Amino acid sequence: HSTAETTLDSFFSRAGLVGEIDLPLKGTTNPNGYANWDIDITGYAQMRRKVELFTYMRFDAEFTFVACTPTGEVVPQLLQYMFVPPGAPKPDSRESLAWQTATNPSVFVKLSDPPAQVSVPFMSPASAYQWFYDGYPTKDLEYGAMPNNMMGTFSVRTVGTSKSKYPLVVRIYMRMKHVRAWIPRPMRNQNYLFKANPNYAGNSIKPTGASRTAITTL
């Protein structure tokens, strides 16, 4: 008799992994013991098609950070997770003064200390993050680019002047809280090709679902 499971907030909560940062010792991958992750909620595979059910949404997001070594081991290393709100400048080097700007919130936590956890608000200047945009921001390479959907950047790094002594892996989960949505639209039935556009594969156009032999044989 109850229908609470089918509510938007219900449908969307749950922390899902949307990001993973590798900070190896020896590597081609993030060689400066630091990393920048502009916040993308498409990181959770499943997510892209789910949200694209609507045109406009709004929400807050609680992020939780899980860090360890590749073997999934814990170590005595300190860390600085920094959030550079949209508009602020991302650190270009392991010593960019951006690490020290007070207006870039930063939370320091030892790897041993349980996961750090913070809530980020509805950034967007528009009244809602909107998934589709039928225009260009004042044949062009800027079609469907709704700009005002930036959530920020998350700069991660070992604390200290010198390189960290260990190989590290940060994972970023994200629970979506207080979700409101508008204008529903046809569920993506075609495979996704790019992060920006609905561009599909005009060759491999597949029927929405399974097929059969005759409209009389079940």
Partner: protein
């Protein structure tokens, strides 16, 4: 039957089929305590809000479907295409009316719907490895509209078998010819560029193919008459 007039524009239509008011809201205006209470947004009444009757597209057995972008279909046309260009912001509604003129001997079905932020995704090179952005003639096809090429995915990788989730109305030839819809301004913002952003798009696809025996006129003139509702502008140039 009975004819209605809004200015110098006089269309002949049926008494009053069932209209579809998109999302139950009526294209109303924007009150005084908004973001621009300094530059009073002038609300075009005179001729700006009247009947525009577009180049009637012809239905065929082989037709795939058609779509127009808004407010793009008019930013070209008339004294509204005058304000849409030489004005900085815009908010409008639309009384869209689609009609077919066919005998009781042709058969078919047209699904007529409105889709906000209708972003056209092209084919992408074929194999999927070309990040081709649709041209400007596909993104904003003027008042001549444009023909879907992949009606099944609405040229955007989405099943049309689900488009009914948008404001829509059917045009079954054996039951009706006229189909009408009322659209309220929809966007994440109270105002927006009437040139750089097409709030929505009018889609009219033949779901049951047009057919007729040999001899009957092979085409069905689909006439799209539409008119702005409680439309608003702001910041002349």
């Amino acid at each position: 039957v009975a004819q209605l007039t809004i200015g110098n524009s006089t269309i002949t239509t049926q008494e009053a089929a069932n209209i579809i008011v998109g999302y139950g809201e009526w294209p109303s205006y924007c009150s005084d305590s908004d973001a621009t209470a300094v530059d009073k947004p002038t609300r075009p009444d005179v001729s700006v809000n009247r009947f525009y009757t577009l180049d009637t597209k012809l239905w065929e057995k082989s037709s795939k479907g058609w779509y127009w972008k808004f407010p793009d279909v008019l930013t070209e046309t008339g004294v509204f295409g005058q304000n849409a260009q030489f004005h900085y912001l815009y908010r409008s509604g639309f009384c869209i009316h689609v009609q077919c003129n066919a005998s009781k001997f042709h058969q078919g079905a047209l699904l007529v719907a409105v889709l906000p932020e209708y972003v056209i995704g092209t084919v992408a090179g074929g194999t999927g490895t070309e990040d081709t952005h649709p041209p400007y003639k596909q993104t904003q096809p003027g008042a001549d509209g444009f023909e879907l090429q992949h009606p099944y995915v609405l040229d955007a990788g989405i099943p049309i078998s689900q488009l009914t989730v948008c404001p829509h109305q059917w045009i079954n030839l054996r039951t009706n010819n006229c189909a009408t819809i009322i659209v309220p301004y929809i966007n994440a913002l109270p105002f927006d560029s009437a040139l750089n952003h097409c709030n929505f798009g009018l889609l009219v696809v033949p779901i049951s193919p047009l057919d007729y025996d040999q001899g009957a006129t092979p085409v069905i003139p689909i006439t799209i008459t539409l008119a702005p509702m409680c439309s608003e502008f702001a910041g002349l140039r």
